Design a protein around this ligand. Structure first.
Ligand SMILES: [K+]
Length: 406
């Protein structure tokens, strides 16, 4: 039978309706004290649940006295609920759950070896949470767990490659908003937010997987394909009035890593899927939300410049009206500039001129002209006006040296 994320005979999953501890298994736990704890963890009341974890976290602190409590039965059961606690909408629950597991790995080093394939992927997923207040404490705990040995952590991304990729597949492909959140106790909005947060983590975890591994594309190609072919990751490229741009930026990073590692030239279909969704995205950037999108504008421009290098700007052909789409994006983006912005524009210019994407005098020059005009009116009110202005003139002066050629 398919055990999902499990490797010790029981099913581990992120959804709410399977992968739960067997009542007869729970009743085999060493102590009645553990049974009450697990009984409260399986309840919804956040208060009693938060208290259950606290009790559990303390039992593990005084591990020497309660070593027999944390036997194979305990680990089996825990491995199943842990996967569910780390998607709790209360970060308190998520923090403690990650802490407990990391503690067990430390207090049980060689006696927990069977379960590393079931714990390490979820531990690392915790370190990949966009919320720094969750990911950083998890990383400090994990780091300490291996005595601050850097190579000992880097080894994890290699050793547990397959399981990590399986966890991503689980999140992106096998699960969705409605299986991750129970509609009985969650509104559509909370479910959207819950999935958003989890899949965002999975993208960052996927990024780190590419960074730490050169031969990631070769070993698990088939699985990488079903992950990157799904519509779930690329859905994070949708701006929303309530959401911030952290997930958006994460996807931009993914596209960048996939291209630099040469995965994109090897999979033209995933290329066209990412570029198309990225171009659709630009059209949703308007004056209404420009202040919100402001901090990613340089990243967008920098990404488009990198992708333009691919076979003399072939990506633009994936949509005949892309030249027009870039035009409306540049015209809007210059109404909310920031450090790095004009640097990235020049990057875009420098690359795209190699096939004369946009007219030098009719489209490029008016852009630079209207930019400085706004800068002079707004500034020098706030920062980083000074930096931004200097950056503009530096890039514009380089742009201006090609005027002779036309
Ligand atoms: K999905």
């Amino acid at each position: 039978t398919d055990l999902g994320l499990g490797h010790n005979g029981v099913r581990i999953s992120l959804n709410y309706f399977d992968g739960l501890p067997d009542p007869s298994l729970l009743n085999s736990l060493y102590s009645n004290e553990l049974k009450l704890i697990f009984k409260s963890l399986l309840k919804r009341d956040e208060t009693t649940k938060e208290k259950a974890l606290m009790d559990l976290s303390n039992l593990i602190s005084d591990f020497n006295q309660n070593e027999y409590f944390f036997n194979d039965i305990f680990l089996l059961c825990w491995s199943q609920i842990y996967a569910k606690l780390i998607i709790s909408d209360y970060k308190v629950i998520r923090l403690q759950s990650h802490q407990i597991t990391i503690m067990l790995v430390k207090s049980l080093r060689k006696k927990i070896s069977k379960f590393l394939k079931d714990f390490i992927p979820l531990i690392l997923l915790g370190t990949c949470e966009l919320d720094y207040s969750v990911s950083k404490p998890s990383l400090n705990e994990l780091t300490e767990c291996f005595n601050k040995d850097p190579a000992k952590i880097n080894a994890l991304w290699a050793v547990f490659q397959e399981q990590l990729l399986n966890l991503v597949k689980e999140i992106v492909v096998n699960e969705n908003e409605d299986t991750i959140s129970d509609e009985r106790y969650s509104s559509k909005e909370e479910s959207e937010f819950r999935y958003h947060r989890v899949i965002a983590s999975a993208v960052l975890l996927l990024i780190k997987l590419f960074v730490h591994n050169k031969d990631v594309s070769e070993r698990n190609s088939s699985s990488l394909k079903v992950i990157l072919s799904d519509e779930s990751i690329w859905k994070l490229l949708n701006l929303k009035n309530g959401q911030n741009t952290n997930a958006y930026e994460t996807v931009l990073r993914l596209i960048d890593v996939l291209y630099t590692r040469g995965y994109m030239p090897s999979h033209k279909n995933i290329m066209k899927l990412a570029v198309k969704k990225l171009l659709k995205s630009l059209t949703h950037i308007t004056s209404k939300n420009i202040l919100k999108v402001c901090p990613v504008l340089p990243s967008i421009l920098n990404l488009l410049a990198t992708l333009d290098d691919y076979e003399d700007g072939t990506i633009w052909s994936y949509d005949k009206s892309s030249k027009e789409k870039v035009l409306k994006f540049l015209s809007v983006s210059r109404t909310s500039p920031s450090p790095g912005f004009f640097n990235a524009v020049f990057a875009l210019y420098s690359s795209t001129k190699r096939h004369s994407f946009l007219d030098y005098y009719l489209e490029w020059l008016p852009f630079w002209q209207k930019s400085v005009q706004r800068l002079n009116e707004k500034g020098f009110s706030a920062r980083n006006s000074a930096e931004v202005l200097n950056e503009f003139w530096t890039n514009f002066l380089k742009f201006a040296e090609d005027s002779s050629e036309e």
